[PDB]
Design an enzyme around this catalytic site. Structure first.
Site, short mmCIF file in Angstrom:
data_model
loop_
_atom_site.label_atom_id
_atom_site.label_comp_id
_atom_site.label_asym_id
_atom_site.label_seq_id
_atom_site.Cartn_x
_atom_site.Cartn_y
_atom_site.Cartn_z
N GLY A 12 0.81 -1.20 0.00
CA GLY A 12 0.00 0.00 0.00
C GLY A 12 0.84 1.25 0.00
O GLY A 12 0.51 2.22 0.70
N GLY A 13 1.93 1.25 -0.77
CA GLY A 13 2.89 2.32 -0.89
C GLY A 13 2.53 3.44 -1.84
O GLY A 13 3.34 4.36 -2.01
N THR A 14 1.39 3.37 -2.53
CA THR A 14 1.13 4.32 -3.61
C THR A 14 0.50 5.62 -3.13
O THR A 14 0.38 6.55 -3.93
CB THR A 14 0.27 3.66 -4.71
OG1 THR A 14 -1.09 3.48 -4.27
CG2 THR A 14 0.87 2.33 -5.12
N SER A 15 0.04 5.71 -1.89
CA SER A 15 -0.55 6.95 -1.41
C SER A 15 -0.37 7.05 0.10
O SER A 15 -0.13 6.05 0.78
CB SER A 15 -2.04 7.03 -1.81
OG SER A 15 -2.66 8.20 -1.33
N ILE A 17 0.35 7.36 3.98
CA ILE A 17 1.40 6.94 4.90
C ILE A 17 2.36 5.98 4.22
O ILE A 17 3.59 6.09 4.38
CB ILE A 17 0.77 6.33 6.17
CG1 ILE A 17 0.10 7.41 7.01
CG2 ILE A 17 1.79 5.55 6.98
CD1 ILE A 17 -0.38 6.89 8.35
N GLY A 18 1.83 5.01 3.47
CA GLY A 18 2.69 4.10 2.73
C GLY A 18 3.55 4.82 1.71
O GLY A 18 4.71 4.44 1.48
N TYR A 149 -13.43 -1.56 12.62
CA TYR A 149 -12.08 -1.12 12.35
C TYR A 149 -11.24 -1.18 13.61
O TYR A 149 -10.13 -1.74 13.61
CB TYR A 149 -12.11 0.30 11.77
CG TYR A 149 -10.75 0.93 11.57
CD1 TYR A 149 -9.89 0.49 10.57
CD2 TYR A 149 -10.32 1.98 12.38
CE1 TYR A 149 -8.64 1.06 10.38
CE2 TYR A 149 -9.07 2.57 12.19
CZ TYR A 149 -8.24 2.10 11.20
OH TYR A 149 -7.01 2.67 11.02
#
Ligand code: NAP
Ligand code: NAP
Ligand code: NAP
Ligand code: NAP
Lengths: 249, 250, 249, 249
Positions: A12-15, A17-18, A149
């Site tokens: 999940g690096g594309t937006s 915190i990631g 959550y």
């Protein structure tokens, strides 16, 4: 710098915190692999990062995607020194309106995907590698319509305690970063489809932080970098909460 | 590498163990460091071993006049404090039914009261954006036989940070806590007994309780303090960072 | 009659939580001793409680008072089954205005006196006796101008964890009740001397409880009665929080 | 007869902690409904309890079974004052041996069925009702090969924190009982099929408790009865740990 010579995987690096974490880790000299489901965001993220950041289109919830993702790491880098299981999300549902889909979707990405991302990564991770899980202060608090959550985030933190012992022989340490309210696309979307709705929701959330502001995503990323670095050598099973004091008070 | 360059740090109890290593790591990051100790001889050796513009003051955190004297020196010498590490502390053992008033008073005066007034006296020097690190322990959150007084003092230290977050919001000073696990130190070795063989069995036994199976080097605790001292901890407030090899985490 | 024949000591039994706890313990059949510093309030408390409640004028902070009180229990009842170290208080001082007296008074009563009440009580307590410490949610939360009180209450709770191991041979279990905001004379006094100021402060404090009201002291007393009874046989070193959910969220 | 006039439902009431709780709840005058998957033990449980304890063969993981169960309560008793979501279990898998089914099985029963047990019960529950969820000390601790079970239990505890705010308008309070090691069939079964293998694990588990013995299921049951009673009126979102001090130390 400290992370130079190290191989890092950020799911999940594309937006958000990631994204900020992949930037920070790469600025420390690490080889970073980032994952996202949407090809367009992944391409923009890789281009924006430059600096030898590698992109793989993968869904953490699909076991076959994880197998393919780690095969690319094995085929290219051949090792994984840092793992940040960032891919996750929040959705709101009050008790009495919880659908089975709402439950299953949250747990599969926030908890199940964390378990099998980590389990699959292990053959690549050498002794002294560091694993970072993404928790939340909502894992330790109660908010209306956030029970599912919150439970998933608590489950994440709980995994790290037992995994200390499971991974003791292999010498990998697993820790948790529990962010408070961080300015991201994901946090904004909870406020609504409308731009005032996201703007007013971010402002109320800022009003809850004791220092009175949302976190920039870079402020969470610094915490991941610390756990990824050798300075965290005596940290194991721990939760590091960066919430501006929100859950600490 | 000049991460904290241009910042002024004070480490109480800087002449040995965790405080010594922290003063070293802070100085290695470019900070101007002030260290305190009760014994002038160790303090001189510590200042000499550190070099790097480290200033030493002999003071007892439990003596209010020493605290006044120490901060007066910082005010003339550097004129500001950007980092505070209230490291000065110690542990002593007494089981319930053997607890003396001496044993209570000494533990809480150094471990808690001195922490309050070290922090309170340091506030005028500290500018907006300063970082305060208190020294906790995993024993503040756990139970060990004959350690109730020490553990209680350590729980009190952590609690002080939660309220001090709100007290210091206007000034912009953030307060955090480092809770060490078993870190090799003269302090820790001396807990095993006063004979040499007796300290080693205590150090080995304490290592056997750690899940990773080794005692901490003092430098590994110090890295957590430097992180907390640096601007990278800008969103951390009131938090406790536990470095115990997972001992209290399991 | 869960406490029939059991001997209970409530320090600071003349007002508030300690008073209601003494009322509740005696209503379950316990022989109750209450202590207070003020002779007039103590006599009034004993007369109102009835039910074989004995009052001793003693200060928990004076060691000689602590010796005299326990000598009366040895001479009168001959043993002590339940100990509630209730005598305590809160005072306000922000960082930058904390005096040495404010610290010393808070910790002498709230921590030191708890320690020596317990240690002096032990020779009367048989195997299976129950010790209840009075904590607070303020021990685990942050409130402005309350750092000194908060630290003392956290210290109380920590004492219990180690006292589990210290008392394991003796067979005594130690637990903590941590109240949230409870309507008492002591709490109203934080609101001011005027009645209008007490009305606004208590209503404000009520607004912080998720259930939206302050506790009656009887609601705290039930938690103590439960811990004193044999139903708590597997509870040791634990904290039981009755806060209407305030620190739980 | 504190619980007399009250209707209590215990999922997993046919054995172990749920059985002892059904016994204790009924002994206080409550009308108790117990559920089990196996008709034989459910019949043995209903007959052994007597005292008008009603049994329903139901699986908490089956949505249709849950619907039918609450329909019988609505048709028969007509309201639900006490809910104890006890049905649950542990299985061991170390990291590197975690199957996707093992995760799904654990989270189905321990978390998902709890969510929907509570949600379906709500229309039957009047204002002032008490809900008790079954946690574990393992939700807050780490044991080799127990990460998924612990993570499930940590999620249960988090559910209560948010549910405090979700149920505040209804006035239903939610609390958690977290047992330590309790002598049950489920605990013995972790020692495997072999008899001395079950004895050797149970004594080892007793050695881990600070008081040095396992709990009888009745000692956990007393905690539930307390939370079910009106004595817990100011307790909400709280976790009550009865572990002999194991997680407290
Ligand atoms: N923001 C906060 O305040 C906050 C607070 C506490 C915890 N957290 C946690 O921090 C993490 C990041 O949150 P964020 O606010 O940065 O979120 P965000 O802005 O929505 O970013 C999420 C990122 O993850 C990717 N992603 C989402 N689902 C994925 C999947 N199944 N497989 C692979 N990649 C996936 C997204 O790309 P695609 O959509 O294209 O896949 C995107 O790159 C989450 O675990 C969240 O729960 C956030
Ligand atoms: N080591 C551990 O395993 C461990 C674990 C958890 C927490 N801690 C905490 O970490 C801190 C450091 O412990 P340590 O093990 O490094 O101890 P240590 O080896 O005994 O070092 C203590 C240092 O503090 C100084 N000091 C002691 N009392 C002082 C006073 N009143 N005023 C000023 N300086 C004073 C000592 O110098 P002088 O003797 O010359 O005064 C020395 O420099 C303490 O707060 C301790 O409670 C340690
Ligand atoms: N009320 C709350 O919301 C709340 C919340 C959390 C925790 N607590 C704790 O609950 C306990 C009782 O509080 P409360 O509100 O009921 O207080 P309160 O109404 O002021 O009653 C305190 C009682 O203790 C006695 N006492 C005080 N100091 C004493 C001493 N040194 N020796 C002997 N007796 C002493 C007082 O009588 P004399 O003045 O005559 O000595 C009085 O009987 C305290 O530990 C408090 O910190 C209260
Ligand atoms: N025992 C301990 O030391 C301990 C410690 C911490 C937490 N806990 C928790 O306490 C709870 C009870 O454990 P226990 O030791 O009492 O277990 P146990 O001895 O195995 O009893 C479990 C009961 O639940 C029923 N049950 C199981 N699955 C069910 C399902 N899907 N639907 C309906 N009923 C079901 C069982 O009957 P059927 O098999 O016929 O369905 C049986 O009546 C669990 O949530 C457990 O995790 C126990």
């Amino acid at each position: 710098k400290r992370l130079e010579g190290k191989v890092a995987l950020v799911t999940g690096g594309t937006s958000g915190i990631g994204l900020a974490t992949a930037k920070d880790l790469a600025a420390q000299g690490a080889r970073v692999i980032i994952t996202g489901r949407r090809q367009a965001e992944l391409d923009q993220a890789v281009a924006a990062l430059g600096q030898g950041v590698r992109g793989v289109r993968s869904d953490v919830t699909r076991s076959a995607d994880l197998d393919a993702l780690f095969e690319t790491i094995r085929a290219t880098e051949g090792r994984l020194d840092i793992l940040f299981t960032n891919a996750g999300g929040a959705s709101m549902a009050a008790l009495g309106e919880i659908s089975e889909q709402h439950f299953d979707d949250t747990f599969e990405r926030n908890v199940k995907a964390v378990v099998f991302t980590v389990q699959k990564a292990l053959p690549l991770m050498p002794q002294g590698a560091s694993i970072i899980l993404n928790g939340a202060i909502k894992g330790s608090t109660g908010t209306q319509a956030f029970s599912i959550y919150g439970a998933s985030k608590a489950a994440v933190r709980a995994l790290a305690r037992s995994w200390v012992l499971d991974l003791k022989e292999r010498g990998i340490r697993v820790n948790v970063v529990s962010p408070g309210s961080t300015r991201t696309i994901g946090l904004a979307e909870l406020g609504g489809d409308t731009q005032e709705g996201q703007d007013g929701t971010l402002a109320y959330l800022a009003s809850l932080v004791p220092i009175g502001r949302l976190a920039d995503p870079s402020e969470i990323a610094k915490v991941v970098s610390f756990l990824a670095s050798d300075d965290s050598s005596f940290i194991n099973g721990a939760e590091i909460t960066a919430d501006g004091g929100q859950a600490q008070v």
